[PDB]
Amino acid sequence: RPSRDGGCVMDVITRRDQRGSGQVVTYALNTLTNIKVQLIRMMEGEGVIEASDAHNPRLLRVERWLRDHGEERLGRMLVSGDDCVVRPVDDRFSRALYFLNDMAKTRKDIGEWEHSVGFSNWEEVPFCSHHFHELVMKDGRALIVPCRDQDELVGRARVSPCGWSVRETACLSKAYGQMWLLSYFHRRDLRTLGLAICSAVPIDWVPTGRTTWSIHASGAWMTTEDMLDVWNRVWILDNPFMHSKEKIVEWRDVPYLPKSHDMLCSSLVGRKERAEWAKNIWGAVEKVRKMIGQEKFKDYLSCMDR
Amino acid sequence: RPSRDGGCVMDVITRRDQRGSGQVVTYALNTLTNIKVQLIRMMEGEGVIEASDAHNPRLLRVERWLRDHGEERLGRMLVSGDDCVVRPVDDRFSRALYFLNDMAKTRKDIGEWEHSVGFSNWEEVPFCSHHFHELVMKDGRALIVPCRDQDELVGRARVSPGCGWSVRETACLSKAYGQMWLLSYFHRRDLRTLGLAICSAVPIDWVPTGRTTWSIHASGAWMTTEDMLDVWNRVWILDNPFMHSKEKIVEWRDVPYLPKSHDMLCSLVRKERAEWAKNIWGAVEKVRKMIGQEKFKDYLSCMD
Ligand SMILES: [Zn+2]
Ligand SMILES: [Zn+2]
Numbered sequence: 291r292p293s294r295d296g297g298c299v300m301d302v303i304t305r306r307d308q309r310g311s312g313q314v315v316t317y318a319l320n321t322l323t324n325i326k327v328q329l330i331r332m333m334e335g336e337g338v339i340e341a342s343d344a345h346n347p348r349l350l351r352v353e354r355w356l357r358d359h360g361e362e363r364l365g366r367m368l369v370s371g372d373d374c375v376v377r378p379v380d381d382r383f384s385r386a387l388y389f390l391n392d393m394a395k396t397r398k399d400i401g402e403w404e405h406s407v408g409f410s411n412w413e414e415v416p417f418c419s420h421h422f423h424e425l426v427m428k429d430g431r432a433l434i435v436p437c438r439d440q441d442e443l444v445g446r447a448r449v450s451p452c453g454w455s456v457r458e459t460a461c462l463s464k465a466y467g468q469m470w471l472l473s474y475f476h477r478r479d480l481r482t483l484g485l486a487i488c489s490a491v492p493i494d495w496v497p498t499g500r501t502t503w504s505i506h507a508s509g510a511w512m513t514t515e516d517m518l519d520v521w522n523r524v525w526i527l528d529n530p531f532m533h534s535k536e537k538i539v540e541w542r543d544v545p546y547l548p549k550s551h552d553m554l555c556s557s558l559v560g561r562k563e564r565a566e567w568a569k570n571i572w573g574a575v576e577k578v579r580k581m582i583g584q585e586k587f588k589d590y591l592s593c594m595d596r
Numbered sequence: 597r598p599s600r601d602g603g604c605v606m607d608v609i610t611r612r613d614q615r616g617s618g619q620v621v622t623y624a625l626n627t628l629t630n631i632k633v634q635l636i637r638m639m640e641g642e643g644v645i646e647a648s649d650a651h652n653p654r655l656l657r658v659e660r661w662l663r664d665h666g667e668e669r670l671g672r673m674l675v676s677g678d679d680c681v682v683r684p685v686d687d688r689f690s691r692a693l694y695f696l697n698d699m700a701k702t703r704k705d706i707g708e709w710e711h712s713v714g715f716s717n718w719e720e721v722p723f724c725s726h727h728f729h730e731l732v733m734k735d736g737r738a739l740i741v742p743c744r745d746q747d748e749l750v751g752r753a754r755v756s757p758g759c760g761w762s763v764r765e766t767a768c769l770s771k772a773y774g775q776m777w778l779l780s781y782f783h784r785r786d787l788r789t790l791g792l793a794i795c796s797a798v799p800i801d802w803v804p805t806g807r808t809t810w811s812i813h814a815s816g817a818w819m820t821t822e823d824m825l826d827v828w829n830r831v832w833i834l835d836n837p838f839m840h841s842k843e844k845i846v847e848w849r850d851v852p853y854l855p856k857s858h859d860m861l862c863s864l865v866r867k868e869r870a871e872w873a874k875n876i877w878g879a880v881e882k883v884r885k886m887i888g889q890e891k892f893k894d895y896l897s898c899m900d
Pocket of ligand 1: 437551
């Protein structure tokens with residue numbers, strides 16, 4: 291806290307409730323606790339409990355439901371810390387707000403007693419800051435890829451952690467670029483931009499730095515291995531949903547979202563801006579190389595049949 | 597020698613002179629004594645010896661010449677085995693054919709007493725199956741690159757030691773050829789293309805094998821699975837004693853080309869070397885399909 295004399299004081303405060311966000315087991319506990327919250331909301335909406343039970347609860351009623359349906363309701367939801375995706379037995383769940391509000395888990399950006407709005411297309415359900423789309427490759431195999439706002443992902447990469455030398459900041463960028471190639475290869479702008487970053491940063495500069503805070507980060511991109519090679523590793527070889535394990539040989543064979551989706555998730559695809567950026571992008575790459583010096587560079591941008 | 601019975605007999609024969617080509621020291625002996633032939637032939641053209649000396653040798657005249665001139669004349673010539681380049685002190689050397697002929701060293705493709713034909717232009721002189729041209733790079737540094745007829749260069753690559761030979765082994769051999777062309781004939785447009793294409797069609801793990809040339813001047817440096825640019829910078833810049841500035845070159849796009857006309861005037865850059873070069877990716881893809889499920893990279897595309 292700022293002191294009234296030009297310097298800084300540190301207060302010492304206490305309290306009982308709330309979760310410290312940097313406890314060793316915040317993720318686990320928040321998951322378990324939020325599972326419980328959703329499991330209760332399920333009960334209210336099915337009819338197992340009602341506002342009466344806030345006063346004198348019908349405990350045998352909830353314990354039967356768990357004995358008889360708990361295991362099944364558990365598999366109806368994805369819960370990661372404080373985020374969920376819930377697929378209830380029917381949409382009474384929308385109106386089921388009593389025990390949710392009573393437990394204090396007040397929903398974001400909606401009236402306290404306003405019905406919850408749902409989705410019938412899973413490709414529109416948000417989870418862990420992403421949406422997920424299904425792509426079919428040139429060989430007929432399906433991918434389901436995580437998508438995100440292009441401007442949100444570039445913008446975090448433009449933020450520097452000062453005192454970071456030209457090498458340390460180049461390495462941080464390779465981290466972002468490598469990651470974009472694992473997870474957002476299906477975004478034209480980002481494949482281009484990540485391929486350019488890898489063509490502008492030395493081959494043997496190992497990447498460093500935090501690219502995401504999600505606990506679903508592989509970090510599999512903080513290697514200096516070939517990025518296609520790691521792609522096949524995660525999307526095909528180690529992917530438990532890929533029955534056929536035939537590796538893909540060139541980036542020209544890794545799919546893209548449909549162009550409509552690209553633009554709609556805030557792609558520059560279309561404008562004279564993106565068009566002229568894509569043209570003159572090697573000039574940018576050469577500047578970064580000259581900035582960095584006599585090191586070993588390789589050319590990954592051109593392997594876009596360009 | 598074939599026998600008259602449907603088989604083959606093996607003759608044991610002897611003789612005194614000539615050189616066994618396989619002897620451990622053919623190169624050094626054929627080199628040393630061809631130095632001597634040419635040192636002699638210099639002497640005749642210079643007036644040190646005449647035909648008269650075949651009978652009455654004026655030894656002190658030749659001993660004087662070696663003493664007063666040997667070390668200088670030694671540097672006037674390049675001698676590899678039976679091949680030479682002589683820069684004599686003047687053009688009398690072209691008629692100096694006695695002794696050259698008396699020593700039995702007959703000249704190929706010329707009348708026994710017909711004057712030799714010389715070259716004013718060092719870039720037009722043949723040595724070790726090559727001409728040598730001077731190239732300036734974009735950064736102003738100069739190279740002197742070896743050159744050889746493309747068709748002879750490719751034709752030797754396009755032939756194989758034999759059947760009973762795998763697809764993997766025949767691939768590996770092709771890598772060795774293509775990677776060598778990248779070291780030494782990168783300045784040829786077609787060879788640069790065909791060399792990169794080969795490198796794009798053959799697995800990155802496959803080490804090259806076989807002999808791409810017999811020359812006693814082949815670095816051998818190409819039978820690696822190192823980056824070819826990485827070796828190119830080594831041999832043409834880092835380890836090149838003739839290279840004062842050692843800034844490394846970053847991309848094939850920066851390695852120069854013969855002047856366009858020398859390229860076409862040295863055997864395809866023609867209507868058909870447009871169809872070929874345009875659709876060469878189809879070729880690479882076919883080859884990768886034959887080879888199957890290995891790790892290929894794309895080196896042709898770093899050519900634009
Ligand atoms: Zn999306
Ligand atoms: Zn030439």
